[PDB]
Structure 1
Amino acid sequence: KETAAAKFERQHMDSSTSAASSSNYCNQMMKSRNLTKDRCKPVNTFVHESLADVQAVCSQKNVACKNGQTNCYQSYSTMSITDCRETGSSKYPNCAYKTTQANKHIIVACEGNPYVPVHFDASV
């Protein structure tokens, strides 16, 4: 079965591209990472840094999570990310997304031993 750590990698990691991300990127990636299977996942962020760099965030700046839990961490450095947001006219199963590249600090929730990212909370 897929661990929470693995699910985070599937939903949020894309080290293969530096940033770029074509206008088609979110349409392709949301589908291929299985985020459009049951519904169109409304919003999702992909991070274009190494797994080690993203994992390292769990030892960086401790910040409150949006849900009020205390196990979130903000990256000290900006990271290359791509925001995917479902378009107004997107209709399942044909999920359509606006692709937006950015360089922002990420905030992830971390859990477990080893202490690793399990949710993407925000970018700031």
Structure 2
Amino acid sequence: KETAAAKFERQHMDSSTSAASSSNYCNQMMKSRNLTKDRCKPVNTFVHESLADVQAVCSQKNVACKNGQTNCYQSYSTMSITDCRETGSSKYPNCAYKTTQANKHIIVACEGNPYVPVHFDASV
């Protein structure tokens, strides 16, 4: 199968690139990470920092999750990220996205033991 932690890495981690996401970045990544298999995932964020730095967020600023749960944490430092948003003319299976790089504090939900990220909640 695939653990929730593994799914988070597949859907949100892209340490390789520093911050040079091209205008085609999201179109390629959303497809390569299998986020356009059953349908076009509407919105998704990729984080370019190291796995160690992102996992460390689970021990940082505790903030309320959008769903009301209390297992969300905000990074003290800003992080290099890329937001992907499906375009209006996007039509599955030909999923199309707008790519936008940014440097913001990320908010992730963490679970388990080890306590690691399992959901990307927001960036601020």
Q: What CA distance in whole angstroms lies between the structure 2 residues aligned with 1:45 and 1:108? A: 11
Q: Does 1:57 align with 2:57?
A: yes
Q: Residue in 1 aligned with 2:90?
A: 90
Q: Residue in 2 aligned with 1:22?
A: 22
Measured after TM superposition, the shift of residue 16 of structure 1 is 0.4
SS of the residue aligned with 1:73?
strand
SS of the residue aligned with 1:82?
strand
TM-score in terms of structure 1 length: 1.00
Q: Residue in 2 aligned with 1:46?
A: 46
Flag as ranges the 4+ runs of structure 1 deviating above 2 A: none
TM-score in terms of structure 2 length: 1.00
Measured after TM superposition, the shift of residue 111 of structure 1 is 0.1
CA RMSD of aligned residues (A): 0.2
Q: What CA distance in whole angstroms lies between the structure 2 residues aligned with 1:81 and 1:103? A: 6
Q: What CA distance in whole angstroms lies between the structure 2 residues aligned with 1:105 and 1:67? A: 19
Gaps of 5+ in 2: none
Gaps of 5+ in 1: none
| Number of equivalent positions | 124
| Identical-residue share of aligned pairs (%) | 100
Measured after TM superposition, the shift of residue 96 of structure 1 is 0.1
Measured after TM superposition, the shift of residue 9 of structure 1 is 0.1
Q: Does 1:70 align with 2:66?
A: no
Q: Does 1:121 align with 2:113?
A: no
